[PDB]
């Protein structure tokens, strides 16, 4: 962490009346929080209703989760509106519990979209390599933006990327709105339940989260993307042998649909030395080159 989100301001330009929100289906839910679909009235100038996604806490939440949701709101408010990030539309801080209102992404999380389109994929409404290459570029653009705003995501994965109109991918963070206890992609590591297969060695062994640890996770995201939604390190459990192999330089082979030039990006993201890993800006530039050559 580079910034203290508790020292960030909350612009009351974001404040929305909670009486104007009609709650619908649950998009995602965890132990202490949820993401719910809602209709927001008078959010538009013409007073036309619109579909939004509302993140909020469950009555099960404690003061830690209440602080975490307020810091999340202050970070989302601070970041501003970028095309490859979920865009904050408003919030309800008075009259009750905190409600973080964002745009609704038509097609949900990228992981489930990739698994759904797996059997309807062609390299050259069919999913293609052109789409995958555009998703990899958009995620590095969004991540390059967060790094410039001194934000470390800490949980970069296909599950925390959303797909909307015109094949636009948006970085999100379900966080407390994800059931990490029942998600096999989160392992028990001490007092925590962490996404070990997406984590840099320095994050696992020293709990260090940098710009470079987020780049490692991006390399895992790329493997997921070009494997069409497969789980990393297939058939390998998170045990004593797994940590040993990662420290010994073992890295996954290319996913089945990854261009050789994308696997090169993956290999550099997974360098044991964080200083030898590319920046998200270098990655954007690298993918730009690859896209232009197509
Ligand atoms: C955690 C603490 C912190 O400081 N974090 C920094 C940080 C950084 C960034 C880039 C984003 C965030 N936060 C969010 O992105 C919150 C959030 N995440 C997913 C959400 O899920 C959905 C949003 C929109 N549409 C959907 C559609 C769907 O199925 C159709 C299904 C789900 C959806 C909704 C939602 O807010 C309401 C937070």
From Swiss-Prot:
Q: How is it modified after translation?
A: Ubiquitinated by SOCS6. KIT is rapidly ubiquitinated after autophosphorylation induced by KITLG/SCF binding, leading to internalization and degradation.
The name on file for this protein is: Mast/stem cell growth factor receptor Kit
Recite the other comments: Numerous proteins are phosphorylated in response to KIT signaling, but it is not evident to determine which are directly phosphorylated by KIT under in vivo conditions.
Concerning what turns on (or off) its expression, the entry says: Up-regulated by cis-retinoic acid in neuroblastoma cell lines.
Q: Which family does it belong to?
A: Belongs to the protein kinase superfamily. Tyr protein kinase family. CSF-1/PDGF receptor subfamily.
The effect annotated for residue 183 to G is: In mast cell disease; systemic
- Binding annotation for ATP: 28-35, 55, 103-109, 159
Identify the domain of life: Eukaryota
Modified residue annotations for Phosphoserine = 184, 254
Annotated disorder: Piebald trait: Autosomal dominant genetic developmental abnormality of pigmentation characterized by congenital patches of white skin and hair that lack melanocytes. Gastrointestinal stromal tumor: Common mesenchymal neoplasms arising in the gastrointestinal tract, most often in the stomach. They are histologically, immunohistochemically, and genetically different from typical leiomyomas, leiomyosarcomas, and schwannomas. Most GISTs are composed of a fairly uniform population of spindle-shaped cells. Some tumors are dominated by epithelioid cells or contain a mixture of spindle and epithelioid morphologies. Primary GISTs in the gastrointestinal tract commonly metastasize in the omentum and mesenteries, often as multiple nodules.
Name the segments for region: Important for interaction with phosphotyrosine-binding proteins. Answer: 1-2
User: Gene encoding it?
Assistant: KIT
Outcome recorded upon mutating residue 179 to V: In MASTSYS, MASTC and mast cell leukemia; somatic mutation; constitutively activated; loss of interaction with MPDZ
Explain what the record says happens when changing residue 55 to M. Answer: Stronger interaction with MPDZ
Q: Which residues carry this modification: Phosphotyrosine?
A: 2, 186, 263
Q: What is the effect of changing residue 179 to Y?
A: In MASTSYS and MASTC; also found in acute myeloid leukemia and a germ cell tumor of the testis; somatic mutation; constitutively activated
Q: What do we know about how this protein assembles, alone or with others?
A: Monomer in the absence of bound KITLG/SCF. Homodimer in the presence of bound KITLG/SCF, forming a heterotetramer with two KITLG/SCF molecules. Interacts (via phosphorylated tyrosine residues) with the adapter proteins GRB2 and GRB7 (via SH2 domain), and SH2B2/APS. Interacts (via C-terminus) with MPDZ (via the tenth PDZ domain). Interacts (via phosphorylated tyrosine residues) with PIK3R1 and PIK3 catalytic subunit. Interacts (via phosphorylated tyrosine) with CRK (isoform Crk-II), FYN, SHC1 and MATK/CHK (via SH2 domain). Interacts with LYN and FES/FPS.
Question: What is this protein for, i.e. what is its function?
Answer: Tyrosine-protein kinase that acts as a cell-surface receptor for the cytokine KITLG/SCF and plays an essential role in the regulation of cell survival and proliferation, hematopoiesis, stem cell maintenance, gametogenesis, mast cell development, migration and function, and in melanogenesis. In response to KITLG/SCF binding, KIT can activate several signaling pathways. Phosphorylates PIK3R1, PLCG1, SH2B2/APS and CBL. Activates the AKT1 signaling pathway by phosphorylation of PIK3R1, the regulatory subunit of phosphatidylinositol 3-kinase.
Which sites are catalytic?
155 (proton acceptor)
- Mapped to this chain, the residue ranges on the Cytoplasmic side of the membrane are 1-294
Q: What is the effect of changing residue 179 to F?
A: In MASTC; sporadic case; somatic mutation; constitutively activated and is much more rapidly autophosphorylated than wild type; requires 2 nucleotide substitutions
**Positions of the Protein kinase domain:** 21-294
Chain residues that bind Mg(2+): 160, 173
């Amino acid at each position: 962490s580079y910034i203290d989100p508790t020292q960030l301001p909350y612009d009351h330009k974001w404040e929305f009346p909670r009486n104007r929100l009609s709650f619908g289906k649950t998009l995602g839910a965890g132990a202490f929080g949820k993401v719910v679909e809602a209709t927001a009235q008078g959010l538009i100038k013409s007073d036309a209703a619109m579909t939004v996604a509302v993140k909020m806490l469950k009555p099960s939440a404690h003061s830690t989760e209440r602080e975490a949701l307020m810091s999340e709101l202050k970070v989302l408010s601070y970041l501003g509106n970028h095309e490859n990030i979920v865009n904050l539309l408003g919030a309800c801080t008075h009259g009750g519990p905190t409600l973080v209102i964002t745009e609704y992404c038509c097609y949900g999380d990228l992981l489930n979209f990739l698994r759904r389109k797996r059997d309807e994929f062609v390299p050259y409404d069919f999913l293609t390599l052109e789409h995958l290459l555009s998703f990899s570029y958009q995620v590095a653009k969004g991540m390059a933006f967060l790094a410039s705003k001194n934000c470390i995501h800490r949980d970069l994965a296909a599950r925390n990327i959303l797909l909307t109109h015109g094949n636009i991918t948006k970085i999100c963070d379900f966080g407390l709105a994800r059931d990490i206890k029942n998600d096999s992609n989160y392992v028990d590591k001490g007092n925590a339940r962490l996404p070990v297969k997406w984590m840099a060695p320095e994050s696992i062994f020293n709990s260090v989260y940098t710009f470079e640890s987020d780049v490692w996770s991006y390399g895992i995201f790329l493997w997921e993307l070009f494997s069409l939604g497969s789980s990393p390190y297939p058939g390998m459990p998170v045990d004593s042998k797994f940590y040993k192999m990662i420290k010994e330089g073992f890295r996954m082979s290319s996913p089945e649909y990854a261009p050789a030039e994308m696997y090169d990006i993956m290999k550099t993201c997974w360098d044991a030395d964080p200083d030898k890993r590319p920046t998200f800006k270098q990655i954007v530039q690298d993918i730009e080159k690859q896209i232009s050559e197509s």
